Design an enzyme around this catalytic site. Structure first.
Site, PDB file in Angstrom:
ATOM      1  N   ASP A 119      -7.351  10.276   0.160  1.00 25.38           N
ATOM      2  CA  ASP A 119      -6.011   9.962  -0.327  1.00 25.38           C
ATOM      3  C   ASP A 119      -5.377  11.230  -0.932  1.00 25.38           C
ATOM      4  OD1 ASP A 119      -5.579   6.844  -0.411  1.00 25.38           O
ATOM      5  OD2 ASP A 119      -7.617   7.189  -1.186  1.00 25.38           O
ATOM      6  N   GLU A 133      -1.552   0.414   3.490  1.00 26.22           N
ATOM      7  CA  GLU A 133      -1.447  -0.396   4.685  1.00 26.22           C
ATOM      8  C   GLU A 133      -0.025  -0.897   4.883  1.00 26.22           C
ATOM      9  OE1 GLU A 133      -4.585  -2.869   3.155  1.00 26.22           O
ATOM     10  OE2 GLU A 133      -6.064  -1.899   4.423  1.00 26.22           O
ATOM     11  N   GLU A 184     -11.927   1.020  10.159  1.00 28.63           N
ATOM     12  CA  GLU A 184     -12.679   1.216   8.940  1.00 28.63           C
ATOM     13  C   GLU A 184     -13.479  -0.044   8.615  1.00 28.63           C
ATOM     14  OE1 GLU A 184      -9.809   1.934   5.830  1.00 28.63           O
ATOM     15  OE2 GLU A 184      -9.071   3.788   6.724  1.00 28.63           O
TER      16      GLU A 184
HETATM   17  O1  LIG Z   1      -5.863  -4.414   1.429  1.00 27.28           O
HETATM   18  C1  LIG Z   1      -7.238  -4.311   1.034  1.00 27.28           C
HETATM   19  C2  LIG Z   1      -8.253  -4.927   2.058  1.00 27.28           C
HETATM   20  O2  LIG Z   1      -7.944  -6.329   2.035  1.00 27.28           O
HETATM   21  C3  LIG Z   1      -8.782  -7.107   2.868  1.00 27.28           C
HETATM   22  O3  LIG Z   1     -10.084  -7.129   2.335  1.00 27.28           O
HETATM   23  C4  LIG Z   1     -10.541  -8.395   1.846  1.00 27.28           C
HETATM   24  C5  LIG Z   1     -11.878  -8.714   2.506  1.00 27.28           C
HETATM   25  O4  LIG Z   1     -11.690  -8.837   3.904  1.00 27.28           O
HETATM   26  C6  LIG Z   1     -12.293 -10.092   1.997  1.00 27.28           C
HETATM   27  O5  LIG Z   1     -13.534 -10.424   2.588  1.00 27.28           O
HETATM   28  C7  LIG Z   1     -12.348 -10.073   0.486  1.00 27.28           C
HETATM   29  O6  LIG Z   1     -13.393  -9.303   0.103  1.00 27.28           O
HETATM   30  O7  LIG Z   1     -11.123  -9.689  -0.077  1.00 27.28           O
HETATM   31  C8  LIG Z   1     -10.687  -8.386   0.328  1.00 27.28           C
HETATM   32  C9  LIG Z   1      -9.350  -8.217  -0.390  1.00 27.28           C
HETATM   33  O8  LIG Z   1      -9.503  -8.153  -1.769  1.00 27.28           O
HETATM   34  C10 LIG Z   1      -8.763  -6.609   4.311  1.00 27.28           C
HETATM   35  O9  LIG Z   1      -9.776  -7.293   5.046  1.00 27.28           O
HETATM   36  C11 LIG Z   1      -8.915  -5.117   4.425  1.00 27.28           C
HETATM   37  O10 LIG Z   1      -8.662  -4.771   5.766  1.00 27.28           O
HETATM   38  C12 LIG Z   1      -7.944  -4.400   3.493  1.00 27.28           C
HETATM   39  O11 LIG Z   1      -8.238  -2.971   3.472  1.00 27.28           O
HETATM   40  O1  LIG Z   2      -9.372   5.605   0.101  1.00 27.39           O
HETATM   41  C1  LIG Z   2      -8.660   4.787   1.061  1.00 27.39           C
HETATM   42  C2  LIG Z   2      -8.087   3.517   0.444  1.00 27.39           C
HETATM   43  O2  LIG Z   2      -9.217   2.779  -0.066  1.00 27.39           O
HETATM   44  C3  LIG Z   2      -8.931   1.472  -0.622  1.00 27.39           C
HETATM   45  O3  LIG Z   2      -8.359   0.560   0.315  1.00 27.39           O
HETATM   46  C4  LIG Z   2      -9.106   0.171   1.452  1.00 27.39           C
HETATM   47  C5  LIG Z   2      -9.769  -1.192   1.272  1.00 27.39           C
HETATM   48  O4  LIG Z   2     -10.579  -1.134   0.114  1.00 27.39           O
HETATM   49  C6  LIG Z   2     -10.595  -1.458   2.509  1.00 27.39           C
HETATM   50  O5  LIG Z   2     -10.887  -2.835   2.468  1.00 27.39           O
HETATM   51  C7  LIG Z   2     -10.395  -0.628   3.697  1.00 27.39           C
HETATM   52  O6  LIG Z   2     -11.184  -0.319   4.850  1.00 27.39           O
HETATM   53  O7  LIG Z   2      -9.008  -0.372   3.850  1.00 27.39           O
HETATM   54  C8  LIG Z   2      -8.215   0.035   2.704  1.00 27.39           C
HETATM   55  C9  LIG Z   2      -7.452   1.214   3.268  1.00 27.39           C
HETATM   56  O8  LIG Z   2      -8.385   2.334   3.569  1.00 27.39           O
HETATM   57  C10 LIG Z   2      -8.003   1.696  -1.836  1.00 27.39           C
HETATM   58  O9  LIG Z   2      -7.663   0.414  -2.373  1.00 27.39           O
HETATM   59  C11 LIG Z   2      -6.732   2.354  -1.294  1.00 27.39           C
HETATM   60  O10 LIG Z   2      -5.826   2.508  -2.394  1.00 27.39           O
HETATM   61  C12 LIG Z   2      -7.101   3.713  -0.713  1.00 27.39           C
HETATM   62  O11 LIG Z   2      -5.894   4.293  -0.179  1.00 27.39           O
END
Ligand SMILES: OC[C@H]1O[C@H](O[C@H]2[C@H](O)[C@@H](O)[C@@H](O)O[C@@H]2CO)[C@H](O)[C@@H](O)[C@@H]1O
Ligand SMILES: OC[C@H]1O[C@H](O[C@H]2[C@H](O)[C@@H](O)[C@@H](O)O[C@@H]2CO)[C@H](O)[C@@H](O)[C@@H]1O
Length: 493
Positions: free
Chosen positions: A51, A184, A378
């Site tokens: 980031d 996102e 990811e």
């Molecule tokens: O925008 C953050 C993250 O949100 C979602 O992640 C979910 C995860 O899939 C659930 O299983 C649960 O753990 O809650 C998370 C959100 O707090 C998205 O699936 C992910 O792509 C995105 O980065």
């Molecule tokens: O460092 C990248 C990004 O990480 C976190 O968001 C993630 C989320 O935790 C996941 O579920 C995942 O694969 O997608 C998101 C986008 O990479 C931090 O919350 C976010 O602020 C940070 O940019």
């Protein structure tokens, strides 16, 4: 086997720890990070992701950028033989899953927010979410004369110029253009900050005055000036059948509901398109690709209302593809769709969440390939286990390796969340090294991506704008590409 196998190689990146450059714009522990990066290099990792936090860099005031700590970080990454995925992070760190450090957007913007609360995404109850500026203010010249898109544009231009040496040298493989919460392209429909808990349906985030006025003007143009924003969609932790909006035969399938959902999801398409136009201008001629991030909203995918997708702004139904229009929008920018929930299996999720991550991945990746764009991904949650890595490898090459040439289907890359001391422990790291090897189709690390047909050429101008009706032709449902039930390149293989 070898060169055929090399054309099957899918590169692997690793996210850096959050806060590697701290909120005070200090690179706090270069020596510790160096040791970790050299372990990744020896493990075969192709590069890292970080980031580039707006709230760190432009903190002092408008156009007062300090790039120095990030130059030191980039220098270290280069010295350690890794490439870099740079996220233009126009959002707050602190209130989403896993966030362990607090990095707000710049205080001078928050100061404007104190006088104009409508610069923030707002829910029906009136709660202001300070993690990202509403799409509503994208083209509103309210930030000391600049619009939000101008802020983002200026920032990307300043990055390109101040990092020009690293760019020229090929350090930076892609620019991940942040487009919302957690970087996102989405609404903040599942805010932990307001008490959301998985698997709540979430809430629509379109009640700021700018979006509300835009909606009201649009319904008037449609011949229904009296239509209002949804008032029967429940609350963050509801289930769909408890709401008038998402129940069977509910408001979502009415002319009003369909209009709303189209309007709401179109705002994201246009937000991404317009900001990517600026990213293309900022990085024109650089040997980088552009990417965006799409969140994986897998809960409620298995019921006909897809309620959590809908509140996030992905208007995806059993009979309406809400993702292929995003892929089509990316095509004119020659951009990568990075889908950020890649590792999950359906059996990992509770039955009451009606969760379909496997099918969602298949849908999104297939739509990107149907639209002839590159698709990356990811893992969503920390995982150190073989089940996770084998699922990632499956998605990376869903029809397996082509012994005879390049695979007919492959992802363009996977970025692993995240470098930590736990990753580097003996067993975890041993399994990760096998993951890297299998992603690499059993080949040794390959420093020159030209060898696996990932050469980096100068970024060209975006192609002409695609009108919204043509983008929405991609809502037509299509059959996904077929998937193997398991990868042919397992880690325990
Ligand atoms: O925008 C953050 C993250 O949100 C979602 O992640 C979910 C995860 O899939 C659930 O299983 C649960 O753990 O809650 C998370 C959100 O707090 C998205 O699936 C992910 O792509 C995105 O980065
Ligand atoms: O460092 C990248 C990004 O990480 C976190 O968001 C993630 C989320 O935790 C996941 O579920 C995942 O694969 O997608 C998101 C986008 O990479 C931090 O919350 C976010 O602020 C940070 O940019």
């Amino acid at each position: 086997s070898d060169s055929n196998m090399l054309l099957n190689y899918v590169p692997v990146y690793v996210m850096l720890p959050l806060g590697v450059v701290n909120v005070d714009n200090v690179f706090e522990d270069p020596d510790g990070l160096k040791e970790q990066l050299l372990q990744l290099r020896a493990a075969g990792v192709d590069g890292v992701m970080v980031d580039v936090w707006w709230g760190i860099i432009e903190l002092k005031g408008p156009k007062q950028y300090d790039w120095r700590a990030y130059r030191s970080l980039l220098q270290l990454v280069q010295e350690c033989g890794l490439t870099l995925q740079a996220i233009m992070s126009f959002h707050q760190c602190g209130g989403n899953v896993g966030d362990i450090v607090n990095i707000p957007i710049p205080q001078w913007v928050l100061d404007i927010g104190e006088s104009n609360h409508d610069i923030f995404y707002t829910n029906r109850s009136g709660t202001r979410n300070k993690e990202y500026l509403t799409v509503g203010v994208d083209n509103e010249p309210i930030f000391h004369g600049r619009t939000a898109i101008e802020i983002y544009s200026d920032y990307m231009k300043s990055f390109r110029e101040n990092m020009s040496d690293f760019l020229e040298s090929g350090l930076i493989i892609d620019i991940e253009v942040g487009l919302g919460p957690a970087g996102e392209l989405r609404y903040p429909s599942y805010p932990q900050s307001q008490g959301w808990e998985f698997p709540g349906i979430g809430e629509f985030q379109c009640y700021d005055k700018y979006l509300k006025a835009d909606f009201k003007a649009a319904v008037a143009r449609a011949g229904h000036p009296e239509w209002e924003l949804p008032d029967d969609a429940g609350k963050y932790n509801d289930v769909p059948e408890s709401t008038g909006f998402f129940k069977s035969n509910g408001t979502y399938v009415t002319e009003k509901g369909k209009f709303f959902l189209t309007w709401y999801s179109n705002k994201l398409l246009n937000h991404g398109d317009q900001i990517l136009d600026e990213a293309n201008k900022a990085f024109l001629g650089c040997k980088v690709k552009l990417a965006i991030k799409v969140s994986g909203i897998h809960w409620w995918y298995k019921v006909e209302n897809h309620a959590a997708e809908l509140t996030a702004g992905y208007y995806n139904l059993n009979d309406r593809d809400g993702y292929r229009p995003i892929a089509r929008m990316l095509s004119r920018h020659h951009a990568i769709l990075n889908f950020v929930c890649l590792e999950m299996r359906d059996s990992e999720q509770p039955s009451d969440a009606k969760s379909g991550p496997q099918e969602l991945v298949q849908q999104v990746l297939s739509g990107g390939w149907r639209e002839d764009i590159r698709v990356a991904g990811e893992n969503a949650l920390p995982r150190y286990d073989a089940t996770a890595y084998n699922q990632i490898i499956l998605n990376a090459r869903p029809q397996g390796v082509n012994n005879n040439g390049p695979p007919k289907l492959s992802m363009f890359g996977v970025t692993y969340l995240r470098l930590s001391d736990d990753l580097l422990q003996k067993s975890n790291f041993n399994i990760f090294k096998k993951f890297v090897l299998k992603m690499h189709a059993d080949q040794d690390y390959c420093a020159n991506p030209q060898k696996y047909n990932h050469a980096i050429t100068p970024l060209k101008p975006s192609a002409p704008k695609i009108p919204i009706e043509v983008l929405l032709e991609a809502t037509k449902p299509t059959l996904p590409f077929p998937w193997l039930p398991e990868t042919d390149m397992k880690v325990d293989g």
